[PDB]
Design a protein around this nucleic acid. Structure first.
Length: 159
DNA sequence: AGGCTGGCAGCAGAATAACCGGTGGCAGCAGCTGACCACAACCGATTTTCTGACC
């Protein structure tokens, strides 16, 4: 399925393009490396043709999962453990999982707790990073005008 | 049978990542003052010494 011209989503680097299929030699054999161009830090990631699904290279989302993550973002549930260390560990695990609904849960919990209390600079950086990957994912998914993706993010945050 | 004497050898030293609770400090400020300048006047003799009339 991975041809030149896609827009695939890495686990926690964001949505990236493809431009070539490298046949770079490993053990005297030409494993089909595919290249990536993710623009948050202009790093190029090259992965083997079959271990991408093992490491979690996930395709773009363009169906009722958009409504699913919208109702996840506008869900009434907000619960965290008592200690900030375990709460941060659980949110970091859900962030590193690389799932859109889980990242939506992370940003709704962090945005609710920041508009209620205001926690910390480290979780502020975490919320900025997770909001960046969610906004970039949906803006390259629906092709829906990035930063007007931020306006529709404001709409679903207002709920 | 070892020992304690002898050089011999080797070495130290000097000179040239967050939460929660609590508690005391602290600064800012209306709000009693309360002692204090502080002008500002007002009198209390005081002494001089004319001023005014007295016979």
């Amino acid at each position: 399925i991975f041809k030149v011209g896609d827009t695939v989503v890495y686990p926690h680097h964001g949505a990236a393009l493809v431009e070539a299929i490298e046949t770079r030699t490993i053990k005297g054999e030409q494993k089909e490396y595919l290249v990536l161009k993710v623009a948050q830090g202009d790093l190029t990631v090259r992965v083997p043709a079959e271990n991408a699904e093992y490491v979690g290279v996930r395709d773009v989302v363009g169906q009722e999962g958009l409504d699913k993550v919208f109702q996840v973002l506008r869900a009434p549930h907000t619960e965290e453990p008592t200690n900030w260390s375990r709460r941060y560990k659980a949110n970091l695990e859900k962030l590193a999982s690389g799932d859109v609904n889980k990242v939506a849960e992370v940003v709704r919990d962090l945005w609710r707790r920041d508009q209620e209390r205001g926690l910390s600079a480290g979780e502020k950086r975490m919320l900025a990073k997770a909001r960046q990957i969610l906004v970039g994912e949906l803006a390259l998914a629906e092709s829906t005008d990035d930063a007007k993706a931020e306006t529709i993010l404001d709409e679903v945050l207002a709920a």
